[PDB]
C-alpha cells in the first residue's frame, strides 16, 4: 500500500517471499505428543526425521 512503502524504507525491512501455513495445536487443547508418523511420496527425498 502507498504507506507501507514509507515504513519499509524507514526500518529497511525485507518482505518475505514465503508465508507460513503451519500446523498449530487447536485452541483450548493441551496434551503430550505421543506419536509422530511421516509418509513420503515416491519421488521426494526423506528428510532427517523420516
Amino acid at each position: 500500500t502507498p504507506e507501507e512503502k514509507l515504513l519499509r524504507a524507514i526500518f529497511g525491512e525485507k518482505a518475505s517471499d514465503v508465508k507460513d501455513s503451519s500446523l498449530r495445536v487447536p485452541n483450548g487443547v493441551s496434551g503430550t505428543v505421543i506419536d509422530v508418523q511421516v509418509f513420503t511420496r515416491d519421488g521426494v527425498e526423506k528428510d532427517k526425521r523420516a
Binding site: 502507498p2 504507506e3 507501507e4 512503502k5 515504513l7 524504507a9 524507514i10 526500518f11 519421488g43
Partner: protein
Amino acid sequence: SQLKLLVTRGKEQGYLTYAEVNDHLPEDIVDSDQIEDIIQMINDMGIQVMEEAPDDLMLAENTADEDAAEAAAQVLSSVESEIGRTTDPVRMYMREMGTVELLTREGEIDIAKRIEDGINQVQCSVAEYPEAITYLLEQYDRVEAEEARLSDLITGFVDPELAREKFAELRAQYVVTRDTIATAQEEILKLSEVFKQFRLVPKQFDYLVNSMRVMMDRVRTQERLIMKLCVEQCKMPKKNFITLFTGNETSDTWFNAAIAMNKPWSEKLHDVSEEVHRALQKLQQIEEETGLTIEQVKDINRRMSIGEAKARRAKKEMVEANLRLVISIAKKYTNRGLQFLDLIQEGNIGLMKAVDKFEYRRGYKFSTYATWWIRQAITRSIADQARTIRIPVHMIETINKLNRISRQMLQEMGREPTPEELAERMLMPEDKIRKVLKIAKEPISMETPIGDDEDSHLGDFIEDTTLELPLDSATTESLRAATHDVLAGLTAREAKVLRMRFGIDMNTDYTLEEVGKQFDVTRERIRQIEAKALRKLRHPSRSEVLRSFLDD
C-alpha cells in the same frame, strides 16, 4: 369421461394413488410421456399423485387451490379428444426420418447426375461474365509473376509452361474479343467455349461468383432506386414502369421522357426526379464496367438462381437417406460427453459436407465414403465440446492410451500399476504421466448432497480466501492515521517531499526529477531532503508507533 370422475374422486379422497391414476386413464394411451403430462397437470391443480395409499398427521391442506383448477380440468377434458406425445425431441426426429422413405437404391447416382447438371447452368451463367474472366486473366499474369502460388488458380485442370501458354492464347483471343466492340458477337461466345474447359480453386470460383452477384445486386439496387422512388413512392404506374423503363433502362427516353409524357403520373415525378436522374448516370456508368445490357445479365443470373436452386433441392433428397445412415452409425457414441441429439446433429453436418464433396465417377458405395466423414465429425465434436475445461485432442488421446495400458497392467500385474511402472511401460517422463493423470478428472457439482441432517451441499462449505480480515482493515486505518501524525511532526519541506516521493495521501507518485522541478530544485537537493527526512524518522522518539506497526 372417466377422467373427470377420477379428478372428482381424487378431490373427495384428498389424494390419489398411482393405481387410481392408472385405472381411470384412457385405454388407448400407449405413449408414457402423455401419461406423465396428464399426471403433472393433475398435480398442478391438485391432488398430488403419490405412489402409495399413505392418519393423524395433517397434510398440505389445499396448496394447489386456485382458478387454475378449472382451467386444468378443461385441459384434462381436452386430452382425451386428441392424442400425441410431442414431448421428446428425439421421437419427432425419428418419426420425420421415418416419413422419408429410406429407398434410394442407385437413385443416388441419378440425383448426383442431377446435381452435376444443375451446378453447370450456374457455370453457363458465369461464362457470360467477362469481368470474372478479366479477373482470371489478371490472376494468371499475377501468379506467373510469383505474386502467389500458381495452383491458386486451379484445383487441377481438365504442366506449367503449357498452362501459361494456354492462358496466353486465351489472352490473345480475349484481346481480339475485346477490341472488336457486331464483331464481339461470335468472338466472346467462341472464347467462352474454350473457356469452359477449366477447373477453378473453390475460393477463387466462389469469390468470383459472389462478386458477380454483388455487381448484379448493385444493378438491382439501382433498379429499386428507380422503382420504389417512382412506382411505390411517386405512384408511377406499374404498367408504365414495365413499359418505358423496362427494355431500355439506360437511356433518358424512359424517365426524362416519363415526366414529359403529360399524364397525371408524369408531372408528379418532378419531386423524386433528382434520384432517378442520378441513378441513370450510375447505371450508365456501371454498364461500362460490365459491358452488358442490364436485361442480359439479369436473365443470366436468373438462370444461375434456377440452377443453384435445382442443385439444393436434389441435395436435400441426397442428404435425407444418409441422415438415416447417420442415425445408424451415431447410435454407438453414447454416454461420453454429449446427448444423443447433439451427436446426430454433428453427424448430419458431416454428411452435408460429404454430399457437397462427393463424385459419381469412382464406383464407391455411398455407405462407405460418407460414413468416414460422419464418424470423423462425430468424434471431433465429442473431443471438442464434451467437458467443462477443454483439454486439447492430443491430451485426450494420451489419456485413453494411459487407461488402456493401466487396465492391461492391472489384469497382468495383479494389482494397481504404479505411475513409476506405468511411465516405465510408456516411454514418457514420470512428471508428464503425473500431470496427465491429474488433468483428466472432471469437476464436481457444487450441489452434491452431503450426509448431514441439515441437508447442505458441498458448495456451502467452501470458504472465501480473497477477503480482507476486518482486523487488517483496522490495522491499515491505524497506520494511515499514525503516518499522518508522524509526518505532522516533521519539517514542512520533509513531509511534503516524503508524501510526493512515496505517494502518501496522493495520486500516482512522482520521480525525484518531477518532485524537484515541482517546487523549484534539482533532483539532488530533493534526494538530500528525502535522506534528511528518513534520517529523522529513523531516529527514535518519533519512531515508536511505526515500529509497533512492524511488530518485528
